Amino acid sequence: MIQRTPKIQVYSRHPAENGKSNFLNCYVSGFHPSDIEVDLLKNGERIEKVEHSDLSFSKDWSFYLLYYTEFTPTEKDEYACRVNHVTLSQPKIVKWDRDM
Amino acid sequence: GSHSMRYFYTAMFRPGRGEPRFIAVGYVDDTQFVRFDSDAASPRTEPRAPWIEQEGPEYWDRNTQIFKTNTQTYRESLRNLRGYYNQSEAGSHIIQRMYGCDLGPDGRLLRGHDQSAYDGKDYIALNEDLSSWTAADTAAQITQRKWEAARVAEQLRAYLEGLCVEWLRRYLENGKETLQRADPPKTHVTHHPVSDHEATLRCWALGFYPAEITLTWQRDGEDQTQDTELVETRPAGDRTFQKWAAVVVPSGEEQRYTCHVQHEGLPKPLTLRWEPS
Amino acid sequence: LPPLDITPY
């Protein structure tokens, strides 16, 4: 029995440009088992239109997934990714920073 | 090798959540081309790459048949392991298996793969000779016996050396312009002040393929490895990858730092710096 | 194209 806590990365597909369409990606990896819940948040509100890749795993058996949605960046709205896994007591939140 | 094809199988026993689920994804290097999920509305093999869509209905029915059968076969496998480890029907369990073949320069098989894992740990694996196994523990020894009696190794060797290589070549041909062309990264450095004494120099590499890449920050030539914050290569979402390397440097002195980028899609390694503007 | 898992674990 092995349990691994997920690594999270919130970033955009292209350099964030206020006003134009882009994609908000939340990459979760290095976790085990596969059960995981990921939500893309906009000002704390959950975004209903979220798509994701198919479950796959790396050399070390750790699973990885990419959740994404098309959005329009603007320095007034706070975007974040909420992830819940068996290894987490409370859902971990990672804020989006257009500089990372 | 030059190119590789891999299949990642994930079978999971989920007590209460439902009957054993089976997922299968196919890759040619860093590109996913197929997917099967015995839990979706219509359990069928679906395309994940444009170039694979040119295959006729026969191909799809073929993949779907195999996968549907695999779903049942894996349910048995899960139960068998449960018994092997004297486990109850109360806890979730996952079996993972990776199949794959590496294409050598001569167009023939360079190396074959087949390894399985139970609950995140190695269980059984086919050896480099493609004729013997390696059991992680006594429970895996049982599987090894079954597989030896059923001549599974020989069956797999045939696949890896033949069918795998054959189809890998077909796929590579079909998606020639995407799978055989390496995309160089778009690079640029950004300056982010943290305090009136220090600033972070972040070197970016976006839209590159394949994922393999090397980013390095240098100060007057010396590699600042010990102070470089490097993130794990991440998917851009459009079949390309991105990655960055940052280093915290003192104000003013930043002009002494250069970023070194290495990627196969580049004739030679790049060397850029931050241009104040 | 994948192989056929005829034999279970």
DSSP string covering A52-98: EPPPEE-TTS-EEEEEEEEE---TTSPEEEEEE-TT-SS-EEEE--T
Please state, as a whole number, how many other Cβ atoms lie within 10 Å of the Cβ of residue A21: 10
Chain A residues in contact with B119 (beta carbon < 8 A): 1-2, 33
For chains B and C, CB pairs below 8 A equal 47
Q: Which residues in B25-52 are b (16+ Cβ under 10 Å) and which e?
A: bbbbbbbbbbbbbbeeeeebbebbbebb
How many Å apart are CA B92 and CA A85, to the nearest integer? 14
Tokens for B23? 């997922």
Contacts of B160 (CB under 8 A, 6+ apart): B99, B101, B109, B112, B113, B114, B130
Q: Is A85 on the interface with B (CB under 8 A)?
A: no
Report CA Rg, chain A: 14
Instruction: Judge whether A32 and A3 are in contact, CB under 8 Å.
Output: yes
**DSSP E strand boundaries for chain B:** 3-13, 21-28, 31-37, 46-47, 93-103, 109-118, 121-126, 133-135, 186-193, 198-208, 214-219, 222-223, 228-230, 234-235, 241-250, 257-262, 270-272
Q: B271 by DSSP, 3-state: which? A: strand
Token pair listed for A19:
């006003």
Q: How many C-beta atoms lie closer than 10 Å to residue B153's C-beta?
A: 19
Closest CA relative to residue A68, chosen from A6, A24, A20, A10? A24
Separate counts of helices (H) and strands (E) for chain C: 0, 0
Residue B225 per-residue DSSP state: G
Report d(CA A43, CA A5) in Å as an integer.
25
Write down which chains contact chain B via at least 3 CB pairs under 8 A.
A, C
Element (H, E) at B157: helix B152-158
- For this experimental structure, what is the resolution in angstroms? 2.7
Chains touching C, CB cut-off 8 Å, 3+ pairs:
B
What is the DSSP code (8-state) at residue B210?
Answer: S
Q: Which DSSP state fits B226?
A: G
Give the Å distances, CA to CA, from A70 to A82, A95, B236, B237: 17, 17, 12, 11
Helix (H, G, I), strand (E, B) or coil at B54: helix
Please tell me the experimental approach by which this structure was elucidated. Answer: X-ray
CA distance A31 to B231: 17
Task: Tell me how crowded residue A72 is: count the other CB atoms within 10 A of its CB.
Answer: 13
Nearest chain C alpha carbon to B124? C9
Domains of chain B: 1-181 (3.30.500.10), 182-272 (2.60.40.10)
Q: Which of B94, B98, B76, B96 is nearest to B26 (CA)?
A: B98
| Architecture of the domain defined by A1-100 | Sandwich (2.60)
Q: Return phi, psi of residue B48, to 5°.
A: -125, 5
| Nearest one of A58, A1, A64 to A31, comparing CA atoms | A64
